[PDB]
Amino acid sequence: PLLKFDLFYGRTDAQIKSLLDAAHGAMVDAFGVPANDRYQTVSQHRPGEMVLEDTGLGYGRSSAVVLLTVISRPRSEEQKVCFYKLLTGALERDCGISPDDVIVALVENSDADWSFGRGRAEFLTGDLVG
Amino acid sequence: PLLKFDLFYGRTDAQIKSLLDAAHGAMVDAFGVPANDRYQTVSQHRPGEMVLEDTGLGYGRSSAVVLLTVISRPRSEEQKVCFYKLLTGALERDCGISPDDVIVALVENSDADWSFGRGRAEFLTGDLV
Amino acid sequence: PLLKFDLFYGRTDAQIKSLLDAAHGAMVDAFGVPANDRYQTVSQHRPGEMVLEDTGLGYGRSSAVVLLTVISRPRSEEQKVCFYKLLTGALERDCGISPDDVIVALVENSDADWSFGRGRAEFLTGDLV
Numbered sequence: 001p002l003l004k005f006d007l008f009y010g011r012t013d014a015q016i017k018s019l020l021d022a023a024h025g026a027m028v029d030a031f032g033v034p035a036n037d038r039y040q041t042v043s044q045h046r047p048g049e050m051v052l053e054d055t056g057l058g059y060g061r062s063s064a065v066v067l068l069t070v071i072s073r074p075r076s077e078e079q080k081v082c083f084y085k086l087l088t089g090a091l092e093r094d095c096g097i098s099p100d101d102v103i104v105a106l107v108e109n110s111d112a113d114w115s116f117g118r119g120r121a122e123f124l125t126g127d128l129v130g
Numbered sequence: 131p132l133l134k135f136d137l138f139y140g141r142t143d144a145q146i147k148s149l150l151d152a153a154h155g156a157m158v159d160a161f162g163v164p165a166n167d168r169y170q171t172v173s174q175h176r177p178g179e180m181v182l183e184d185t186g187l188g189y190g191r192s193s194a195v196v197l198l199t200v201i202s203r204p205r206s207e208e209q210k211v212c213f214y215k216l217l218t219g220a221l222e223r224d225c226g227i228s229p230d231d232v233i234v235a236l237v238e239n240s241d242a243d244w245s246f247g248r249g250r251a252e253f254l255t256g257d258l259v
Numbered sequence: 260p261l262l263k264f265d266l267f268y269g270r271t272d273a274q275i276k277s278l279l280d281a282a283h284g285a286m287v288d289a290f291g292v293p294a295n296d297r298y299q300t301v302s303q304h305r306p307g308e309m310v311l312e313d314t315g316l317g318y319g320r321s322s323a324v325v326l327l328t329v330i331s332r333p334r335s336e337e338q339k340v341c342f343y344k345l346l347t348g349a350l351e352r353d354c355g356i357s358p359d360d361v362i363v364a365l366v367e368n369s370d371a372d373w374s375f376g377r378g379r380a381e382f383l384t385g386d387l388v
Contacts, residue, residue: 038312053168059247088249099248106243113365117318119347183297189376218378229377236372
């Protein structure tokens with residue numbers, strides 16, 4: 001999958017790397033994909049450029065908040081549930097980010113909807129599985 | 131849903147917050163979700179960073195152009211059609227943005243594809259909806 | 260469709276425009292859409308802000324790496340395969356970007372999920388086919 005993060009400015013480069021490493025690990029373990037299946041962007045925002053409330057659930061938000069949008073081929077409900085739990089556990093333990101500050105939206109596509117390089121559709125050619 | 135706006139730089143902070151409030155209102159009006167079901171991001175762009183034409187329709191575009199991308203569980207065609215009209219209505223009235231300067235694309239997902247907090251899938255657990 | 264690019268900072272305005280023009284052409288060639296069906300954004304990143312490996316495929320990426328996200332109504336598998344090829348071809352010829360530096364992910368939607376202007380759902384009204 002592709003992991004796109006929206007965060008506020010204020011982290012050091014190492015803290016941003018840490019966040020990305022922690023999240024990548026959670027994804028690999030929840031999804032069972034290769035360790036080098038790593039595709040991640042970070043967009044940093046000024047105050048004002050995100051409004052992230054809680055739908056009345058009683059979260060907890062700060063300027064440390066992390067919004068993650070994932071584009072992925074179909075995963076089981078169990079894999080998605082586990083990814084969410086692994087993600088917040090990693091970001092808490094590794095980065096000191098409260099689980100109240102993590103929000104994830106996932107969108108799905110399929111085999112023909114990826115090219116990782118060279119103009120090839122690797123899920124279609126079978127270079128990747130599949 | 132999650133509302134992601136791409137706009138050009140130039141608005142003041144209060145003008146940005148107006149676009150966000152106007153759009154959020156429209157969304158609540160069209161979709162009937164809780165008022166605090168508010169998830170929005172804004173990416174501001176230098177000249178050059180968007181090219182947005184009109185497929186020959188005759189719109190009107192300026193530096194005020196707003197591109198909105200929505201991630202949402204399925205809504206009806208009716209709800210979508212109403213959203214678009216509500217959205218440009220509110221942006222015109224509240225923000226002075228011509229409806230010519232508004233573009234929307236929506237993509238859909240499912241109950242399992244959201245986590246609003248704490249690693250929980252609240253549509254799956256039944257905490258929402 | 261809508262084409263959203265994530266790239267690293269460092270290109271001149273002309274190089275950004277070259278990259279968009281190139282990508283646009285390849286899209287129009289693959290998909291058979293009007294030349295003015297042009298909707299593109301670019302988000303530029305500091306080093307650190309993208310990590311793009313290769314799943315062991317043996318691709319040699321550089322800082323020129325382009326990540327493209329496409330939102331589109333359904334196209335045939337052939338058209339998608341053709342787009343990826345034409346896109347890399349064009350980015351290499353027109354921009355000097357290695358095909359190893361081009362990544363694409365596509366997400367689909369449908370007729371009711373687009374508003375190009377005026378809060379009109381043009382695929383639904385028939386303004387566009």
